[PDB]
């Protein structure tokens, strides 16, 4: 799961038997060896400098990974290998359905393109970042599967809407702090009024609120949440212009003069986390690539 | 590593004992499986065994249960497992063995945060086997070497230090991607 | 007049960690290849031109390639003529390594 989309992992035993000749380059050119026999002898004794060469000629040299029971066009794909410790090839989980590969025990064949033209073909035509759509109807081929899907569903699951959040009806004319004046005890637990996303994440880190605990978040953008014909449940109106409107999931405080900026959204930290993840991923890829 | 109920597996990682979830008595977990495998293959019989194993490990007793015990009663295996779990939780004061709100499950903690995973997790002591298809019997690698007398190709498999074969569908993929040099050099060079 | 001038322009902070994982994952090269191919009509011609330019690079200055991956060299050369710093041959370093090899997960 730690591998990037443009990367695979090759065992140390497999790599030395595929890039042997390029390592012979690395030894001869760098003047750490003299003859072909001497270089091969140094290779056969597993010298500590051998892996420095077979970590240096593999950076930028793509390898074609092929699933033995090939079924579709995406059964063979190019990857940028890295040296891993063990005896198994580490594969990215998103491309697995592209290979239709599970992990109950399966075998993958590696091939090395030698020609410079072949390396250009492998890098510029068979990498899993320009083949993200299937040729059948044009539907995504790398989408979050079972575990990631469950994680995202649990993240964006919301709070408990109605009778599952309150034992008694909230009509219940009581607890008004009732007297002839509004000078009484004022707790009004209500829900937190966080400034923005990062304030909400920070307050969640302190374990002040849970994942599905509702909260109010100020909105400084246009309307993004998918609404419909809808109806405002209750719009309060003071004798002075206040336009207190309460919709199904957001609150708008307009006025009679100016500055309609009081948009508040009822949400949970999971939706904030997902939106922040997507937004910062975009704004990080944009600035990383200049 | 495979169980007795068709739940096979490939070992992916090996963690230090301080980096694994621990029960409410501090014992680190020895193996972590994927729950989603149960609804797919539809083998609930492992779960029972899992829970039952725990009871044995906490009572110094072994069970030899004949199959189809649902003839004496209705849901007899449930009665057996839950009664054994309650007896193990009562004789040895371990109130996490039989939680009387989600029986068979318990709330384990995180080995690298000291936090309880939000939902209770099924734990047990199943009987896991080790299979003969070992990885060291499946690795391969070949830069050059022996060639066949007639066809002049790498011989075969691993004993003869052969090379992996590409044919039919594989070529159809390479033609699909529109790569000509790659396909050319897998037949000539 | 339109009151969205800065609400859509406030800088997103905490982006420093979402600037690095792009750089060792090959994300910069992947996002540069498509921008180079954003104007090409036929991708096969572009690939063949890149391969021929890399072959010329290998021929003219043979005794340098084997590490530099001349295809990366020509890609960096093409990306470096319109800004887009793109260090030479997309070479990766180990700034903090008093050792020979990283574990690589």
């Amino acid at each position: 799961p730690s591998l990037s989309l443009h990367r695979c992992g090759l065992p140390r035993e497999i790599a030395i038997e595929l890039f042997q000749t390029f390592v012979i380059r690395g030894l001869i050119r760098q003047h750490l060896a003299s003859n072909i026999g001497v270089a091969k002898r140094k290779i056969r004794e597993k010298e500590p400098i051998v892996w420095k060469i077979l970590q240096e000629v593999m950076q930028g040299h793509p390898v074609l990974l092929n699933r033995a029971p090939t079924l579709h066009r995406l059964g063979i794909q190019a990857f940028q290998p890295i040296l891993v410790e063990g005896r198994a090839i580490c594969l990215h989980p998103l491309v697995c359905k592209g290979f239709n590969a599970d992990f109950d025990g399966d075998q993958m064949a590696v091939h090395v393109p030698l020609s410079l033209e072949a390396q250009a073909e492998a890098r510029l035509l068979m990498f899993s970042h320009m083949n993200l759509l299937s040729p059948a109807i044009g539907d995504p081929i790398s989408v979050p599967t079972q575990d990631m899907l469950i994680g995202l569903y649990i993240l964006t699951s919301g709070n408990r809407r109605g009778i599952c959040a309150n034992r008694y009806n909230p009509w219940n004319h009581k607890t008004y702090q009732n007297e002839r004046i509004d000078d009484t005890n004022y707790k009004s637990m209500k829900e937190p009024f966080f400034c923005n996303f990062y304030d909400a994440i920070g307050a969640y880190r302190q374990k002040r609120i849970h994942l599905d605990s509702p909260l109010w978040l100020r909105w400084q953008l246009d309307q993004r949440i998918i609404a419909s014909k809808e109806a405002p449940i209750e719009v309060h109106y003071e004798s002075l212009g206040t336009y207190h409107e309460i919709y199904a999931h957001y609150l708008i405080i307009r006025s009679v003069k100016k500055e309609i900026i009081d948009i508040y959204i009822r949400t949970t930290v999971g939706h904030i986390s997902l939106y922040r993840e997507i937004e910062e991923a975009i704004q990080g890829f944009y600035q990383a690539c200049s | 590593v495979a169980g007795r109920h068709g739940n096979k597996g490939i070992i992916s990682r090996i963690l230090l004992r301080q980096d694994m979830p621990y029960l409410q008595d501090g014992r680190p977990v020895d193996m972590i499986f994927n729950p989603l495998g149960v609804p797919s293959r539809m083998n609930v019989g492992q779960i029972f065994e899992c829970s039952l194993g725990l009871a044995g490990s906490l009572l110094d007793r072994h069970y030899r249960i004949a199959p189809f015990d649902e003839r004496y009663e209705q849901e007899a295996s449930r009665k057996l497992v839950f009664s054994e779990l309650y007896e193990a939780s009562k004789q040895t004061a371990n109130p996490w063995v039989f939680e009387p709100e989600y029986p068979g499950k318990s709330r384990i903690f995180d080995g690298r945060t000291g936090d309880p995973f939000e939902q209770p997790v099924i734990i047990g002591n199943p009987y896991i086997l080790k299979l003969i298809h070992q990885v060291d019997d499946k690795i391969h690698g070949r830069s050059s070497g022996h060639y066949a007398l007639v066809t002049q190709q790498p011989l075969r498999g691993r004993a003869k230090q052969g090379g992996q074969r590409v044919g039919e569908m594989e070529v159809w993929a390479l033609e699909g991607f529109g790569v000509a040099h790659i396909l050319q050099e897998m037949l000539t060079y | 007049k339109d009151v969205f001038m800065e609400a859509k322009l406030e800088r997103v902070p905490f982006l420093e960690e979402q600037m690095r994982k792009v750089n060792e994952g090959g994300g910069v090269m992947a996002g540069d290849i498509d921008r180079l191919m954003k104007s090409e009509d036929n991708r096969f011609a572009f690939v063949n031109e890149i391969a021929a330019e890399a072959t010329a690079y290998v021929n003219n200055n043979r005794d340098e390639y084997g590490h530099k991956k001349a295809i990366h060299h020509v890609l960096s050369n093409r990306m470096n003529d319109a800004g887009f710093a793109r260090p030479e041959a997309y070479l990766e370093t180990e700034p903090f390594s008093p050792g020979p090899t990283y574990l690589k997960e």
Binding site: - | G178, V179, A180 | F44, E49, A51, A52
Partner: peptide, 9 residues
């Protein structure tokens, strides 16, 4: 890529 082939002037 084996359709036409490169020329380079």
């Amino acid at each position: 890529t084996g359709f036409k082939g490169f020329v380079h002037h």
